[PDB]
């Protein structure tokens, strides 16, 4: 077998808006369906069983609903803590089979980074890498532009991107930009700059330092 | 309470095989059906099998047929799953669950999960930089370590041996060009709380058996 289709991996929902999670099966499993949530620690809970049971210490927000095929999970009220990957599982027939998840994204209100830029340490210049790391902090949406300049010279090719998980309390990312430079590269040049641009900054932010 | 503790991350390589342990403790071990679950790069989930403690009886996913084997000790409340002939398609986290009857049958714990890495490459430790400004009078402040060049996936991070966790921002490894990975940590604070705390990471890295502490100096002091 039995196929379980989440159509929708990636959805979009707003803090106290009402969220709908649907699962389809190949063929009818008879409400022997269950629902996970999966945080992005890798952590796994289950909420709901036999189609609209709550597990004990769920909250009341959530529900399930469906029959002979079609099965949804219901979030009567997003809270930030419901940052998740939820999944159905049928147990029906062997082998249990589960659908391929649905990822939250929780749409709150714009807040611009705080931003910090590191030189390298000489504990590492001295094996002959230089990583220079710009952080943009608990901002919101996830877009931003990160642009370094080495003397002024726009960079381009010699950086790579993380952005945590949206945070479980305040819905905001974190991402660090590490320009990767020789040592004989990173000592040819003086000044060291991260340019941001995001949508809660009236102008981009740059953070710099002199070796 | 209720806790399935997975035994550690393991690279293995091509062909081998690895047992995989959930020690579990706070119910009657030999009362509920153990079963295993993967879930690979995709976070893609299956049923593996599982096994009734009591009496040694298993159920495979026919996919897992010629892949695992499922075993408990009675003794230790533990349960095993040893995974044979592995290639990289089996590279993935695996988690044993405990089955709660309510027929309503459902997987009412889990454990934490257990990074499998499947590889020719030998293991590397990280090594661990600090991160601090070149100097200071903001609203908050940031400090953190650089955790580079490590093989294979996982390393843990915490901050004053668990004592700080919050502000902090541990950022997901990048595979690097070199085909090792890294990854930051970083933590904020409020600039008049700065100076109430001295600021220290300690990095693991189980499958190169690495413990490291990297202390981020302040530089509070001027002449």
């Known amino acids: 077998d039995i196929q379980m289709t989440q159509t929708t991996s990636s959805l979009s929902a707003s803090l106290g808006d009402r969220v709908t999670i649907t699962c389809s099966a190949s063929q009818g499993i008879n409400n022997y369906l269950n629902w996970y949530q999966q945080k992005p620690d890798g952590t796994v809970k289950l909420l709901i069983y036999?189609?609209?049971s709550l597990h004990s210490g769920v909250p009341s927000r959530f529900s399930g609903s469906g029959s002979g095929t079609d099965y949804s999970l219901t979030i009567s009220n997003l809270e930030p803590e419901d940052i998740a990957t939820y999944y159905c599982?049928?147990?029906?027939?062997?082998?249990?089979?589960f659908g391929g998840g649905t990822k939250l994204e929780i749409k709150r209100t714009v807040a611009a980074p705080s931003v910090f830029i590191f030189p390298p340490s000489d504990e590492q210049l001295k094996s002959g890498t230089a990583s220079v790391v710009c952080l943009l902090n608990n901002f919101y949406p996830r877009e931003a532009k990160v642009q370094w300049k080495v003397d002024n010279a726009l960079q381009s090719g010699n950086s790579q991107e993380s952005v945590t998980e949206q945070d479980s309390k305040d819905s905001t990312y974190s991402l660090s930009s590490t320009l990767t430079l020789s040592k004989a590269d990173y000592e040819k040049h003086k000044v060291y700059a991260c340019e941001v641009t995001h949508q809660g900054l009236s102008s981009p932010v740059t953070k710099s330092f002199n070796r | 309470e209720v806790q399935l503790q997975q035994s550690g991350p393991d690279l293995v390589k091509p062909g081998a095989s690895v047992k995989i342990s959930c020690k579990t403790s706070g119910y009657t071990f030999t009362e509920y059906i153990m079963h295993w679950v993967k879930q690979s790069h995709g976070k893609s989930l299956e049923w593996i099998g599982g096994?009734?403690?009591?009496?040694?009886?298993?159920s495979y996913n026919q996919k897992f047929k010629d892949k695992a084997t499922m075993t408990v000790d009675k003794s230790s409340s533990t349960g095993y799953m040893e995974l044979r002939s592995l290639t990289s398609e089996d590279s993935a986290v695996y988690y044993c669950?405990?089955?709660?009857?309510?027929?309503?049958?459902?997987?009412?714990?889990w454990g934490q999960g257990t990074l499998v890495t499947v590889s020719s490459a030998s293991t590397k430790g990280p090594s661990v930089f600090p991160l601090a400004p070149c100097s200071r009078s903001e609203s908050t402040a940031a400090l953190g370590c650089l955790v580079k060049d490590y093989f294979p996936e996982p390393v843990t991070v915490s901050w004053n041996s668990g004592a700080l966790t919050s502000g902090v921002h541990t950022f997901p490894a990048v595979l690097q060009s070199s085909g090792l990975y890294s990854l930051s940590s970083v933590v904020t604070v409020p600039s008049s709380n700065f100076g109430t705390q001295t600021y220290t990471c300690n990095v693991d890295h189980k499958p190169s058996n690495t413990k490291v502490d990297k202390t981020v100096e302040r530089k509070c002091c001027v002449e």
């Open positions: 669950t405990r089955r709660e009857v309510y027929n309503y049958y459902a997987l009412d714990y």
């Open positions: 036999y189609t609209s």
């Open positions: 096994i009734i403690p009591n009496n040694g009886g298993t």
């Open positions: 599982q049928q147990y029906s027939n062997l082998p249990y089979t």
